[PDB]
Design a protein around this motif. Structure first.
Motif, PDB file in Angstrom:
ATOM      1  N   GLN A 110       4.179  15.925   9.262  1.00 50.67           N
ATOM      2  CA  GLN A 110       5.250  14.923   9.938  1.00 50.67           C
ATOM      3  C   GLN A 110       5.601  13.681   8.037  1.00 50.67           C
ATOM      4  OE1 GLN A 110       6.319  16.476  12.957  1.00 50.67           O
ATOM      5  NE2 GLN A 110       6.166  14.542  13.233  1.00 50.67           N
ATOM      6  N   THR A 111       6.688  13.099   8.360  1.00 39.61           N
ATOM      7  CA  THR A 111       6.772  11.887   7.707  1.00 39.61           C
ATOM      8  C   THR A 111       7.031  10.922   8.138  1.00 39.61           C
ATOM      9  OG1 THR A 111       9.151  12.781   8.819  1.00 39.61           O
ATOM     10  CG2 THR A 111       8.680  14.102   6.566  1.00 39.61           C
ATOM     11  N   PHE A 112       6.493   9.957   7.201  1.00 44.75           N
ATOM     12  CA  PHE A 112       6.712   8.396   6.847  1.00 44.75           C
ATOM     13  C   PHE A 112       6.289   7.939   6.145  1.00 44.75           C
ATOM     14  CE2 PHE A 112       2.338  10.466   5.522  1.00 44.75           C
ATOM     15  CZ  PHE A 112       1.996   8.875   4.382  1.00 44.75           C
ATOM     16  N   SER A 113       7.648   6.410   5.990  1.00 44.72           N
ATOM     17  CA  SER A 113       7.666   5.706   4.684  1.00 44.72           C
ATOM     18  C   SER A 113       6.493   4.949   4.290  1.00 44.72           C
ATOM     19  CB  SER A 113       8.486   4.602   5.767  1.00 44.72           C
ATOM     20  OG  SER A 113       9.851   5.027   6.210  1.00 44.72           O
ATOM     21  N   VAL A 114       6.368   4.644   2.781  1.00 44.21           N
ATOM     22  CA  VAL A 114       5.740   3.953   2.668  1.00 44.21           C
ATOM     23  C   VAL A 114       6.046   2.900   2.235  1.00 44.21           C
ATOM     24  CG1 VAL A 114       3.488   3.924   0.428  1.00 44.21           C
ATOM     25  CG2 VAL A 114       3.556   6.716   1.931  1.00 44.21           C
ATOM     26  N   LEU A 115       5.731   1.383   2.062  1.00 40.04           N
ATOM     27  CA  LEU A 115       6.007   0.235   1.897  1.00 40.04           C
ATOM     28  C   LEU A 115       4.752  -0.403   0.175  1.00 40.04           C
ATOM     29  CD1 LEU A 115       8.218  -2.511   1.520  1.00 40.04           C
ATOM     30  CD2 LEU A 115       5.968  -3.438   2.637  1.00 40.04           C
ATOM     31  N   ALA A 116       4.871   0.320  -1.240  1.00 39.26           N
ATOM     32  CA  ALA A 116       3.617   0.119  -1.924  1.00 39.26           C
ATOM     33  C   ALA A 116       4.255  -1.303  -2.189  1.00 39.26           C
ATOM     34  CB  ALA A 116       4.381   1.285  -3.305  1.00 39.26           C
ATOM     35  N   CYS A 117       2.456  -1.450  -2.219  1.00 41.86           N
ATOM     36  CA  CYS A 117       2.602  -3.368  -3.264  1.00 41.86           C
ATOM     37  C   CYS A 117       1.138  -3.402  -3.815  1.00 41.86           C
ATOM     38  CB  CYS A 117       1.634  -3.551  -0.722  1.00 41.86           C
ATOM     39  SG  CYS A 117       2.918  -3.410   0.156  1.00 41.86           S
ATOM     40  N   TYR A 118       1.774  -4.317  -4.080  1.00 41.53           N
ATOM     41  CA  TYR A 118       0.961  -4.501  -5.464  1.00 41.53           C
ATOM     42  C   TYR A 118      -0.167  -6.341  -4.815  1.00 41.53           C
ATOM     43  CZ  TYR A 118       1.694  -0.426  -7.120  1.00 41.53           C
ATOM     44  OH  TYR A 118       1.696   1.015  -7.032  1.00 41.53           O
ATOM     45  N   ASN A 119      -1.538  -6.620  -4.918  1.00 41.41           N
ATOM     46  CA  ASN A 119      -1.255  -7.995  -5.093  1.00 41.41           C
ATOM     47  C   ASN A 119      -0.967  -7.701  -3.510  1.00 41.41           C
ATOM     48  OD1 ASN A 119      -0.838  -8.211  -8.068  1.00 41.41           O
ATOM     49  ND2 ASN A 119      -2.900  -8.658  -7.202  1.00 41.41           N
ATOM     50  N   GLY A 120      -0.538  -7.750  -2.665  1.00 39.58           N
ATOM     51  CA  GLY A 120       0.202  -8.311  -1.229  1.00 39.58           C
ATOM     52  C   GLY A 120       1.350  -7.946  -1.723  1.00 39.58           C
ATOM     53  N   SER A 121       1.900  -8.172  -2.277  1.00 41.18           N
ATOM     54  CA  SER A 121       3.438  -8.016  -2.571  1.00 41.18           C
ATOM     55  C   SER A 121       4.357  -6.832  -2.115  1.00 41.18           C
ATOM     56  CB  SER A 121       3.952  -8.849  -3.592  1.00 41.18           C
ATOM     57  OG  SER A 121       3.581 -10.175  -3.721  1.00 41.18           O
ATOM     58  N   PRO A 122       5.473  -6.644  -1.643  1.00 42.34           N
ATOM     59  CA  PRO A 122       6.035  -5.111  -1.928  1.00 42.34           C
ATOM     60  C   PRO A 122       6.753  -5.122  -2.869  1.00 42.34           C
ATOM     61  CG  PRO A 122       6.222  -6.818   0.431  1.00 42.34           C
ATOM     62  CD  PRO A 122       6.051  -7.450  -0.793  1.00 42.34           C
ATOM     63  N   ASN A 142      -2.796   1.489  -9.791  1.00 43.42           N
ATOM     64  CA  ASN A 142      -4.547   0.961  -9.378  1.00 43.42           C
ATOM     65  C   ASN A 142      -3.802  -0.235  -9.058  1.00 43.42           C
ATOM     66  OD1 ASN A 142      -5.432   3.240 -11.499  1.00 43.42           O
ATOM     67  ND2 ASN A 142      -5.971   1.524 -12.682  1.00 43.42           N
ATOM     68  N   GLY A 143      -4.675  -0.862  -7.851  1.00 39.55           N
ATOM     69  CA  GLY A 143      -4.074  -1.868  -6.996  1.00 39.55           C
ATOM     70  C   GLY A 143      -2.628  -1.759  -5.976  1.00 39.55           C
ATOM     71  N   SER A 144      -2.757  -0.458  -5.911  1.00 35.59           N
ATOM     72  CA  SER A 144      -2.100   0.121  -4.952  1.00 35.59           C
ATOM     73  C   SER A 144      -2.300  -0.029  -2.960  1.00 35.59           C
ATOM     74  CB  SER A 144      -0.920   1.357  -4.614  1.00 35.59           C
ATOM     75  OG  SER A 144      -1.690   2.116  -4.678  1.00 35.59           O
ATOM     76  N   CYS A 145      -3.735   0.228  -3.407  1.00 40.64           N
ATOM     77  CA  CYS A 145      -4.684   0.673  -2.494  1.00 40.64           C
ATOM     78  C   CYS A 145      -4.676  -0.705  -0.943  1.00 40.64           C
ATOM     79  CB  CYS A 145      -5.884   0.734  -2.550  1.00 40.64           C
ATOM     80  SG  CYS A 145      -6.719  -0.318  -3.575  1.00 40.64           S
ATOM     81  N   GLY A 146      -4.385  -0.110  -0.065  1.00 39.68           N
ATOM     82  CA  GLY A 146      -3.823  -1.106   1.118  1.00 39.68           C
ATOM     83  C   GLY A 146      -2.449  -0.869   1.800  1.00 39.68           C
ATOM     84  N   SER A 147      -1.482  -0.249   0.822  1.00 36.72           N
ATOM     85  CA  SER A 147      -0.246  -0.289   0.899  1.00 36.72           C
ATOM     86  C   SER A 147      -0.230   0.837   2.204  1.00 36.72           C
ATOM     87  CB  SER A 147       0.300   0.350  -0.290  1.00 36.72           C
ATOM     88  OG  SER A 147       0.097  -0.254  -1.881  1.00 36.72           O
ATOM     89  N   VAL A 148       0.532   1.067   3.380  1.00 35.64           N
ATOM     90  CA  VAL A 148       0.506   1.655   4.641  1.00 35.64           C
ATOM     91  C   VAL A 148       2.067   1.998   4.256  1.00 35.64           C
ATOM     92  CG1 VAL A 148      -0.791  -0.225   5.718  1.00 35.64           C
ATOM     93  CG2 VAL A 148       1.241   0.002   5.850  1.00 35.64           C
TER      94      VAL A 148
END
Ligand SMILES: Cn1cc(CNC(=O)N(CCc2ccccc2)Cc2cccnc2)nn1
Ligand SMILES: Cn1cc(CNC(=O)N(CCc2ccccc2)Cc2cccnc2)nn1
Lengths: 304, 304
Positions: A110-122, A142-148
């Motif tokens: 299955q597919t999905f969109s990822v919104l890559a974020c750093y320091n809580g900013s997209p 590094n720092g992208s963790c938590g991006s969904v």
């Protein structure tokens, strides 16, 4: 006409991104209602990652050690709990931008969109597939963790992925929003084997139908095949076996184009055995497998 | 690590999209401050498109004939004017979601994100390049007109493109936000020649640097070349000639990788002359030209 690797509009998800800091580690969190979800490794230092005992590491932490910042305003943390590989930080304020949402565990392919974020900013948005081996070929630093990762059905955001780590092989691993890793991965700095990956056959066939709809038809041939004959070819080229379930989901595309699924399978068979001979399909010189039958229908019908 | 065709987060642009209807024609509009910008062909029926006299067609229209709907609420139109191929509808309400913005005319070879919309609602977001021949290889269906292209620098949205039409060849043509078409195109239902397109050489070189940074180095060779020798090869393969301006913008990538620009040019030369030999670079079986040197630096540094 035209066919692009299109991502969902990311606005509803941008309004949920926050920055979570614990000690000296900062990553991204997802603020939905009065809960902030983030990877549990936010409580680790680089030194802790070799073999973390998350239960022991979390016991040294109190609500006031988790600094959650939404834009420029600070959120007051009133509760913390670990669920699998995610931390749930209860905050005293419900996110005013919380969209209608669901937490879903997607299936491989299955597919999905990822919104890559750093320091809580997209920083960016891209479309990808959950590989059959449960890794994603993302673009994360590094720092992208938590991006969904997510999908959107009209006004409902279905969150399916939270980014946790990059394997030494350069591919990415993460969890569903309940913190359950996709695949055999563990949140630890240890070399981990991703399984043998395969090509998502139903997605390539869906993309071949998208190519026909958009005018690229050079690959169509006068041949047909059977599910068993096609699967002998799929096996040889590390394609996932095609099932009647896959043929069934391809029904609408087969009906729209008038090309029977097994006839499209025979075109795929010839492309596998002969290659592209220096030609392209939808601007690609390889067989694309990151578009499901649903994505092809959605893009070719303009569903908003 | 990893390298994706990443689009800018579309949230700031989603908050600007409205639906504009005039007579029986409906398309998308961009609501910034108290002005709604949309393609001027919103005033035409399919019948008018053969040879429209926009000045005469617009004279039959009053403010009350332009129905502008933002989400579910109606906007009151208090003024209308045509500027080149766009209509500017003055509304009595400033868009509360208006981001910091600029209108910019991008150069051919530059990239931007497109938020494809239907009936004023966002369906998807994708990254693309303005081709050297001033077309875009988009993914647009009937009703997508008024969808815009943009770039974002921290909090400022630079709108660069408004979608108008698809040529009989399947490629797309549109305007800047002042309604000036990119290229020789006219908003009329007549067969129109897009020029000979070329490959954006500086972008392919930028993408080869991104490949090196991310571990794909098989294409690196022991050769070097000169700007003149490389341009003889570029000419033969319909690549745009490389200039010292292009070498200068590649400086940061050359410095990061330690690979002199002319050495990367020699790798590109060998790839052009020999092909990929069934191999891939960053998951692509062809030379990608939709990433500028700025996009490579941004993606490889995680700029939000
Ligand atoms: C300031 N700071 C540093 C970090 C930790 N590092 C990361 O961001 N990643 C890995 C964390 C990890 C390591 C080992 C086992 C599990 C998890 C995610 C990543 C990195 C590169 C590419 N793709 C993903 N978080 N916040
Ligand atoms: C209800 N409705 C119908 C339309 C008109 N049609 C469109 O949307 N397009 C073309 C309009 C046009 C034709 C000829 C010269 C100039 C402009 C844009 C398009 C279509 C397909 C792929 N990419 C772009 N607008 N709203």
């Amino acid at each position: 006409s035209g066919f692009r690797k299109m991502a969902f509009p990311s606005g509803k998800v941008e309004g949920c991104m926050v920055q979570v800091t614990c000690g000296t580690t900062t990553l991204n969190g997802l603020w939905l209602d009065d809960v902030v979800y983030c990877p549990r490794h936010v409580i680790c230092t680089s030194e802790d990652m070799l073999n973390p005992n998350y239960e022991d590491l979390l016991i040294r932490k109190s609500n006031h050690n988790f600094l959650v910042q939404a834009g420029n305003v600070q959120l007051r943390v009133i509760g913390h709990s670990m669920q699998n590989c995610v931390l749930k930080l209860k905050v005293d304020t419900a996110n005013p931008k919380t969209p209608k949402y669901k937490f879903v565990r997607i299936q491989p392919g299955q597919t999905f969109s990822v919104l890559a974020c750093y320091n809580g900013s997209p920083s960016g948005v891209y479309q990808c597939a959950m590989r059959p081996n449960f890794t994603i070929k993302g673009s994360f630093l590094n720092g992208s963790c938590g991006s969904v990762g997510f999908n959107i059905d009209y006004d409902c955001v279905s969150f399916c992925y939270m980014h946790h780590m990059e394997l030494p092989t350069g591919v990415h691993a993460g969890t569903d929003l309940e913190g359950n890793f996709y695949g055999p991965f563990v949140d630890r700095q240890t070399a981990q084997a991703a399984g043998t990956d395969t090509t998502i056959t139903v997605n390539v066939l869906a993309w071949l139908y998208a190519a026909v709809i958009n005018g690229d038809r050079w690959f169509l041939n006068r041949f047909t095949t059977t599910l068993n004959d096609f699967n002998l070819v799929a096996m040889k080229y590390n394609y996932e076996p095609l099932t009647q379930d896959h043929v069934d989901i391809l029904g609408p595309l087969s009906a729209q184009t008038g090309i029977a699924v097994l006839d499209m399978c025979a075109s795929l068979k010839e492309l596998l055995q002969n290659g592209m001979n220096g030609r392209t399909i939808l601007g690609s010189a390889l067989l694309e497998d990151e578009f499901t039958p649903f994505d092809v229908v959605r893009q070719c019908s303009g569903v908003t």
